[PDB]
Structure 1
Amino acid sequence: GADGVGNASGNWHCDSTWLGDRVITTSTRTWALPTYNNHLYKQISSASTGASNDNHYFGYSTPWGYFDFNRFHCHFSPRDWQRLINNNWGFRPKRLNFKLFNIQVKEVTTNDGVTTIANNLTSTVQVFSDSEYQLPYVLGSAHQGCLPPFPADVFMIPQYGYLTLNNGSQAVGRSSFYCLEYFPSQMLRTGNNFTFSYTFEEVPFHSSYAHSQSLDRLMNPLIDQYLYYLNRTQNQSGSAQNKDLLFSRGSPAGMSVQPKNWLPGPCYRQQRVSKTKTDNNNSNFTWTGASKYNLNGRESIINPGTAMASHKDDEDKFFPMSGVMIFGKESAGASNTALDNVMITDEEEIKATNPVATERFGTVAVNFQSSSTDPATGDVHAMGALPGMVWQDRDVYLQGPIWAKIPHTDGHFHPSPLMGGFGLKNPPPQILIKNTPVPANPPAEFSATKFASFITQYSTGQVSVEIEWELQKENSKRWNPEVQYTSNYAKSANVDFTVDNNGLYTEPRPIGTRYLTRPL
């Protein structure tokens, strides 16, 4: 778009419109973009430092930044989240509309103690979207820098970096270097705007419900089965302990031995740790007792891992060591902050279909019983996909990620992104933004040496994102009332999800989606 300097290039579109089976959200925020890296790319490495082989990395930092609207509180206000989670069985993304407008480039001059900031009306910010996914996709790794939950909050734009292959601190012949100046990008003075629109692929609805039934309780409790199972191997009503083979048919007085059609979901057990520090071991096991994976002689913790229940009935005090998502409160520090500065999610409502993360999967025969060799079973702590298995994927949270790019691989098994959300062959693309460098005054004699002297400058503008979501309506024939999410009627000093007296918005708990119920 073309406009004079004194002429808005867009309006503040933020709203929340529901119609039928669709909810269209639009959120507008204002962003600050600084010069990053001094308009330079810089090779970045784990060289020096001596970080453990696990942490060794090689890659690049970029002069560009990016936009990230991959969190639900980017487009769903908490009261809108409630409308979703309280009345819908599912939902998914469908289309997306993005706009960059009202961009103002400013020049900064520092003389002595005093700094002056003036408008540079001829400078340009450049935006481009990686629609062919040619750049390393850095979204979908739960990074900060996303659009803020509170529309009145101004955010800084995160800087783009990526990585490639690394052996230790060194690189390899295949490792890749990307110059974002190589792509075509739209240049904008304060009069220009920028827009694009995107359609999501077909993906399934997310499960904004819990099961009112469990896998081991699907049968009719009033009706014996016609199937029989081997019941005893030692005779009932015998004076000694004499060998026998006694068969019984399925009965309600024994749901635990009735033949069944299905298996619980896959499991990959994690250590159980109590929220009350006393019960725990007096050691520092978050690594040595970690459930981890082993890629290229390099260990990386599994978190959040295969979707499993967080604790059993009545054991609310526990949690898997790396098998739940944990959001920090606004006060929490960056490292080694106390329990009550963070919020731990509880995926307990899937215990209906999925193993508890802290427990075994089951028991397995491991020998051939005979009159001589006593039978033997062992426990299963890793259980891969078996035919018959049914499972519920890990739930999403107002604060949590929305989607992820499915890695481009020959093969993938059930590629829901492990942290929750939609796994996309072709996600929404990255939007890269950079301030055009503005050289200061060159010398009066020619010098072919790289230009290192630039007007210090930063830019600010608004950003608009419209997303149409589909809803899956609830058709439940349940008589009794369902569980619903609700603010606490009682009194307190602070409304939930609000600014305080200093003006700080705070999200008090994580809100997931599984409240309505349906049969299994």
Structure 2
Amino acid sequence: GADGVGNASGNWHCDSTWLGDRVITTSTRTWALPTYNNHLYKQISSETAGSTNDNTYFGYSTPWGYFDFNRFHCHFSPRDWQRLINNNWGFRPKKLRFKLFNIQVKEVTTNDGVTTIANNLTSTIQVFSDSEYQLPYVLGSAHQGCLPPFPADVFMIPQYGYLTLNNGSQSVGRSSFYCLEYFPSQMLRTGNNFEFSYSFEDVPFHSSYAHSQSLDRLMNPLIDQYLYYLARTQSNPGGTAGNRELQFYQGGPSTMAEQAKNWLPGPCFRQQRVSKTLDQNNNSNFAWTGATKYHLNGRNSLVNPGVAMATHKDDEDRFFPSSGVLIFGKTGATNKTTLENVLMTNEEEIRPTNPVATEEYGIVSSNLQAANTAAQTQVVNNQGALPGMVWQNRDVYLQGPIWAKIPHTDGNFHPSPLMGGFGLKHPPPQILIKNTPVPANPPEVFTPAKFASFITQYSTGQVSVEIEWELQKENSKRWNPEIQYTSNFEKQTGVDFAVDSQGVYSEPRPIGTRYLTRNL
């Protein structure tokens, strides 16, 4: 920060720049930060509300807030998102630049119902980014409080709190307490501003393409293989009795399923099938009971969304996996809603390489046949990785999360966030912010005790974030036209992705990245 009160500390930048193979998206918002917990750290636990053995937790809640811009629609307008997914086979972030400026602090007083708000010029806020990843990382959990979709909106900064190890509702001795005033933090008055730059580590391009071939069909339809398979264990029946024979054919156009193949579909961890038409579902509650969930340290944790898998089969639109999809709300929807209010995403583009989430991986033989014994087989509901598997990660959506932090561990297998996006070992740091305490008048004779009495105040201002995205051009030689993302065209009562008569911005549908096709 340089100049004084009457000089703005930074300009509004919200813009998109499409140049060559890069796209530089800048977005600026206006934020407001309350005073959390009356400047106190409080240990929160599930002991207060009984809950259940699976939902128990122990942790801390802090006065600090934090900035979240982990969703795409923060950085992209629906138009810009349309250019991205129509013209390109992939994109990944490169650089990041972050600014706070035009900081204002207000003090508020309450007298007999009157609420008076006045500028407090000399009070400060505290901002620090954690570069060393020393704090618990609560980003990537898909919480709210991210910058709004719509530039003209104003948002409130969420509170920062974290969870640690526990036994029941108590605290095991490995539990950690992190005091956030124990880090260096820059203090900013109304003239000061805050800025830093960041550079993403190298990650694979996201795949914005949907394959035009399937694993089983990669063959050549016109030509007949030179590899035999075992066609029949009996002689061709003449209508009398089956007679033992071994007969081998060649894989060919007639029979593709029997034909030899180099590759296997991706792994699957299966989940229940739910239909959108109510009368086709069973009458019972199978939501939690018939759920697909993993058992960790005595806790049954629902598997959501789970391993990336095709949501439904070919001809079945209405079915969806119980836990296997990302689900979004329509504008103005509460936290408890019915089916019509949610926006449900499906992955139909991974059908070629991936199993259907609601169905088996395959079928495998469970016993040794003999003359007297008959061949038996069992179904494979779950399958780990086998040599020769290929798969496709879950798509990212305009509302979906951009990145998540790969935990620090001895090992991991093909880390990518199951919700979607870019797994990062060193993600964009957490930016934390707090209103510095201002004490109310002290008693005039010394007492050691804690104040607990402060001037109520809040601070507002603008925040801007600029990410440099890298692109991968579409090389395809396909003759016929691609699928594209297309606006409505026919007349309707109001425009999609635009404010209504009341000024409420609304997103009608989710938008995935996979339209353009390429060979498998």
Normalized against structure 2, the TM-score is what?
A: 0.99
Equivalent residue, structure 2, for 1:126: 126
Which amino acid in the other structure matches residue 228 of structure 1? Y
Equivalent residue, structure 2, for 1:253: 254
Q: How does 1:68-217 map to 2 (within 5 A)?
A: 68-217=68-217
Equivalent residue, structure 2, for 1:434: 434
Q: How does 1:269-308 map to 2 (within 5 A)?
A: 269-308=270-309
User: Could you tell me how far 1:299 is from its partner in structure 2?
Assistant: 0.6
- Shifted more, 306-315 versus 46-55: the winner is 46-55
CA distance in 1, matches of 2:318, 2:371: 44
Which amino acid in the other structure matches residue 211 of structure 2? H
User: Could you tell me how far 1:240 is from its partner in structure 2?
Assistant: 2.3
CA distance in 1, matches of 2:152, 2:267: 43
Equivalent position SS for 1:278: helix
Which amino acid in the other structure matches residue 429 of structure 1? P
Equivalent position SS for 1:466: strand
Equivalent residue, structure 2, for 1:512: 512
Superposition RMSD on alpha carbons, in Å?
A: 0.7
Q: How does 1:228-267 map to 2 (within 5 A)?
A: 228-236=228-236, 238=238, 239-267=240-268
Question: Aligned residues: percent identity?
Answer: 82
The answer for unaligned runs of 5 or more in structure 2 is none
User: Could you tell me how far 1:485 is from its partner in structure 2?
Assistant: 0.3
Equivalent residue, structure 2, for 1:356: 356
CA distance in 2, matches of 1:240, 1:159: 77
After superposition, the C-alpha distances for 1:356-403 in whole angstroms (9 at most, x for unaligned) are: 000000000000111211101111100000000000000000000000
Q: Which runs of 4+ in 1 moved over 3 A?
A: none
Equivalent residue, structure 1, for 2:461: 461
Which amino acid in the other structure matches residue 382 of structure 2? A
Which amino acid in the other structure matches residue 219 of structure 1? M
Equivalent position SS for 1:162: strand
Equivalent residue, structure 2, for 1:486: 486
Which amino acid in the other structure matches residue 218 of structure 2? L
CA distance in 2, matches of 1:47, 1:3: 50
After superposition, the C-alpha distances for 1:418-457 in whole angstroms (9 at most, x for unaligned) are: 0000000000010000000000100110111001111100
Matched, 1:314 2:315: yes
Equivalent residue, structure 2, for 1:30: 30
Matched, 1:475 2:475: yes
CA distance in 2, matches of 1:109, 1:359: 61
CA distance in 2, matches of 1:415, 1:23: 26
User: Could you tell me how far 1:236 is from its partner in structure 2?
Assistant: 1.3
Equivalent position SS for 2:137: coil
CA distance in 2, matches of 1:16, 1:191: 28
CA distance in 2, matches of 1:494, 1:265: 42
CA distance in 2, matches of 1:167, 1:2: 50
CA distance in 2, matches of 1:170, 1:452: 27
Higher helix proportion, which one?
1
User: Could you tell me how far 1:237 is from its partner in structure 2?
Assistant: 5.2
CA distance in 2, matches of 1:407, 1:24: 29
Equivalent residue, structure 1, for 2:408: 408
After superposition, the C-alpha distances for 1:311-366 in whole angstroms (9 at most, x for unaligned) are: 0111000000000000011222112x111111000101110100000000000000
Which amino acid in the other structure matches residue 370 of structure 1? A
Which amino acid in the other structure matches residue 9 of structure 2? S
Equivalent position SS for 1:231: strand
CA distance in 2, matches of 1:494, 1:388: 50
After superposition, the C-alpha distances for 1:127-146 in whole angstroms (9 at most, x for unaligned) are: 00011000000000000000
User: Could you tell me how far 1:48 is from its partner in structure 2?
Assistant: 3.2
Which amino acid in the other structure matches residue 340 of structure 2? D
Q: How does 1:385-424 map to 2 (within 5 A)?
A: 385-424=385-424
Equivalent position SS for 1:350: coil
After superposition, the C-alpha distances for 1:207-235 in whole angstroms (9 at most, x for unaligned) are: 10100000011000000001110111010
Equivalent position SS for 2:466: strand
CA distance in 1, matches of 2:44, 2:83: 45
CA distance in 1, matches of 2:48, 2:163: 18
CA distance in 2, matches of 1:506, 1:384: 41
Equivalent residue, structure 2, for 1:371: 371
CA distance in 1, matches of 2:395, 2:476: 20
Which amino acid in the other structure matches residue 341 of structure 2? N
After superposition, the C-alpha distances for 1:190-221 in whole angstroms (9 at most, x for unaligned) are: 00000011000000000101000000110000
CA distance in 2, matches of 1:60, 1:329: 32
CA distance in 2, matches of 1:447, 1:11: 47
Equivalent residue, structure 2, for 1:19: 19
CA distance in 1, matches of 2:141, 2:358: 25
CA distance in 2, matches of 1:235, 1:495: 67
Which amino acid in the other structure matches residue 244 of structure 1? E
CA distance in 2, matches of 1:106, 1:331: 30
Equivalent residue, structure 1, for 2:335: 334
Which amino acid in the other structure matches residue 311 of structure 2? S
CA distance in 1, matches of 2:413, 2:121: 52
CA distance in 2, matches of 1:66, 1:370: 67
Equivalent position SS for 2:271: coil
CA distance in 1, matches of 2:3, 2:166: 47
CA distance in 2, matches of 1:122, 1:47: 41
After superposition, the C-alpha distances for 1:132-172 in whole angstroms (9 at most, x for unaligned) are: 00000000000000000000000000000001001110011
CA distance in 1, matches of 2:430, 2:369: 60
The answer for unaligned runs of 5 or more in structure 1 is none
